[PDB]
């Protein structure tokens, strides 16, 4: 065989590159940032109809001012979320304040490359981390198993990512309202999903300065789906 | 580094099997047959020694049947050295329980712990598994007389009658044929010997190639006795059933 922390002749780490392929097989997750807030949405993708879809938990709270969505080998994300929640609460204990979104993301990404022959392999899951703070305002971050993180105005990850990203390139502008961003996530999710989009197989969430991080109900999302269909038929 | 020479003893095959456990079972199938039969008033343990030499000391010998405590014994099939490592651990475990609770260890609890040790060697550590299968014969005041088996996988099951080692397929068919629930010990003694006599790879079954033991309540009033048979006692019981 071969070492776990080996470089390829092109100068890339084999295991990190292979973990990126696992993330491409994962279910779609989309995030959009506005001046009124940040929206996070995901495809649930139940493997069978007998599975109770509401138990599928791919959107997660880290703190009141920071939320998180995931895609790939979702079981690997549990220890990442556990670390994030501890990091956020620990900083509040040491400094009597909220922790910056960027500083939280950096703390999670420090775990990434702690593998070799530390854990036995990289994480096989990517994360969209959304939040707000007083200094840099509303923010969206894409955290990879390479240990790298980029800030984004909008970003998609998972199987329908390259198609959804191209659509986000055209649709995003700096004046988007929160409502406009909610509909836009639903629209793009409906496009890249296999099965027909409804309130049971897709889930929305958002983070605002005033109310903090909130996962939407199935009743609330269902109305936004109905509002979306009506507007597309209106021209 | 040393990665080059690692056999990876604790991995799955593409079919979802454990290579080393399967190969350890293949090893055990060439070992001398051992039979355990459970009657209403006792338990029999019978085992065949591996191709004997005439200059072997037979009376002061122990290969197949071992005593774990006063109420529990085991029959061995596989590598003897590996078995003794496990037997000493089981003996210690029994004494820990007695020290802690002031009661003799229940049979299943002893069996489970020994089987859990075997399981560990198949999931972590990178070491080869123990090439040993046990038949456990014992008594306690909860379930009475009990027969169990364990194998390198660390999986264990309970039985009325069972064989391990060589020719188990043929031996299990014969036991399934003649066994019934209201059976006595003396009948079970006869069944055990008759089954070995028909499944053996030797020309004829003799006293010097056997190990035998019973666990009866044949002591005086409500107590269990372990009898490990002497050579002359095996010679007599073989004549008494008309095999020689």
């Amino acid at each position: 065989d071969r070492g776990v922390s080996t470089f390829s002749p092109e100068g890339r780490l084999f295991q990190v590159e292979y973990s990126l392929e696992a993330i491409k097989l994962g279910s779609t997750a989309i995030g959009i940032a506005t001046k009124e807030g940040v929206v996070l949405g995901v495809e649930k993708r139940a493997t069978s109809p007998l599975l109770e879809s509401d138990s599928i938990e791919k959107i997660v709270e880290i703190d009141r001012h920071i939320g998180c969505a995931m895609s790939g080998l979702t079981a690997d994300a549990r220890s990442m979320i556990e670390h994030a929640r501890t990091a956020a609460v620990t900083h509040n204990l040491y400094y009597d304040e909220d922790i910056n979104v960027e500083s939280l993301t950096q703390s999670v990404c420090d775990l990434a490359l702690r593998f070799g022959e530390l854990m036995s392999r990289p994480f096989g899951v990517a994360l969209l981390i959304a939040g707000h703070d007083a200094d840099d305002g509303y923010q969206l971050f894409h955290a990879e198993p390479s240990g790298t993180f980029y800030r984004y105005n909008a970003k998609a990850i998972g199987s329908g990512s390259e198609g959804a990203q191209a659509e986000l390139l055209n649709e995003w502008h700096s004046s988007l309202t929160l409502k406009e961003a909610e509909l836009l996530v639903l629209k793009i999710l409906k496009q890249v999903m296999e099965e027909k989009l409804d309130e049971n197989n897709a889930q929305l969430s958002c983070i605002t300065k005033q109310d903090g991080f909130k996962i939407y109900d199935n009743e609330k999302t269902a109305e936004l789906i109905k509002e979306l269909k009506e507007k597309e038929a209106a021209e | 580094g040393s990665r080059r020479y690692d056999s990876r003893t604790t991995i799955f095959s593409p079919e979802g099997r454990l290579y080393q456990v399967e190969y350890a079972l293949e090893s055990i199938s060439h070992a001398g047959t051992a039979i355990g039969i459970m009657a209403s008033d006792g338990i029999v343990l019978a085992a065949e020694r591996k191709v004997t030499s005439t200059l072997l000391e037979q009376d002061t010998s122990t290969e197949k049947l071992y005593k774990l405590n006063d109420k529990i014994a085991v029959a061995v099939a596989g590598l003897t050295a590996d078995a003794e490592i496990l037997i000493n651990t089981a003996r210690i475990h029994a004494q820990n329980y007695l020290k802690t609770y002031n009661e003799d260890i229940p049979v299943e609890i002893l069996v489970r712990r020994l089987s859990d040790i075997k399981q560990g060697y198949t999931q972590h550590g990178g070491l080869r598994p123990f090439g040993v299968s046990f038949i456990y014969a014992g008594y306690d005041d909860r379930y009475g007389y009990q027969l169990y088996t364990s194998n390198p996988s660390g999986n264990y099951t309970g039985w009325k009658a069972i064989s391990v080692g060589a020719n188990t397929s043929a031996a299990q068919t014969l036991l399934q044929m003649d066994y019934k629930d209201d059976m006595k010990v003396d009948d079970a003694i006869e069944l055990a010997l008759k089954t070995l006599s028909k499944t053996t790879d030797s020309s004829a079954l003799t006293y010097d190639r056997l190990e035998f033991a019973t666990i009866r309540k044949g002591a005086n009033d409500g107590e269990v006795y372990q009898k490990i048979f002497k050579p002359q006692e095996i010679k007599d019981i073989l004549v008494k059933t008309g095999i020689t």
Partner: protein
């Protein structure tokens, strides 16, 4: 903590334990239950150092409950008492020992007999027809030596117990705020509400 008593009669074991919890010059509580059910037919009362008592009792409770689930079987009172003794015997040579004295009352369902064990913080175990920890014994033992018989009923045992509490309330220096009484028999564990 202070007063814990135990009496074994024909068909049951009766435990009586004081209700007071006192710190400094203040009685902080007068309804404290100084006991834990270890299994359906086994009960343990306790007394000693603050904090240690409950921590130890609950630790034993958790271990016996774990055993019950694992084996789907109830350990005998003798077996439980031996486990508890060993834990205290380990403790006495630790960096910081458990300063807790206990009584274990149980009904053995296999033998159909009640059993009472007295164990101190050193790990000193004895089976007894009647037992006590602390200063209580200096009054109750002589009293029970006189009035106790081995063939007594549960009702007779409760009257015998009333006689002990009355004596303690007369001659003990501290106000221990009465006792909670519990009975252990073939049908399990129950509490006497009016004592």
């Amino acid at each position: 903590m202070d007063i814990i008593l135990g009496i074994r009669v024909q068909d049951s074991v009766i435990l009586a334990s004081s209700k007071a919890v006192t710190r400094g010059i203040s009685v902080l509580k007068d309804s404290d239950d100084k006991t834990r059910q270890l299994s359906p037919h086994t009960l343990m009362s306790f007394a000693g150092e603050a904090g240690d008592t409950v921590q130890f009792a609950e630790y034993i409770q958790a271990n016996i409950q774990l055993y019950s689930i694992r084996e789907d079987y109830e350990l005998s009172p003798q077996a439980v008492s031996s486990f508890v003794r060993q834990e205290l015997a380990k403790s006495i040579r630790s960096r910081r020992p458990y300063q807790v004295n206990v009584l274990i009352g149980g009904y053995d369902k296999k033998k159909n007999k009640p059993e009472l064990y007295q164990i101190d913080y050193l790990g000193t175990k004895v089976e007894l027809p009647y037992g006590a920890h602390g200063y209580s014994g200096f009054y109750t033992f002589s009293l029970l030596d006189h009035h106790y018989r081995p063939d007594m009923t549960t009702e007779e045992g409760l009257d015998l117990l009333k006689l002990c509490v009355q004596e303690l309330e007369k001659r003990m220096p501290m106000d221990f705020k009465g006792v909670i009484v519990k009975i252990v028999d073939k049908d399990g564990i129950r509490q006497v509400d009016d004592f």
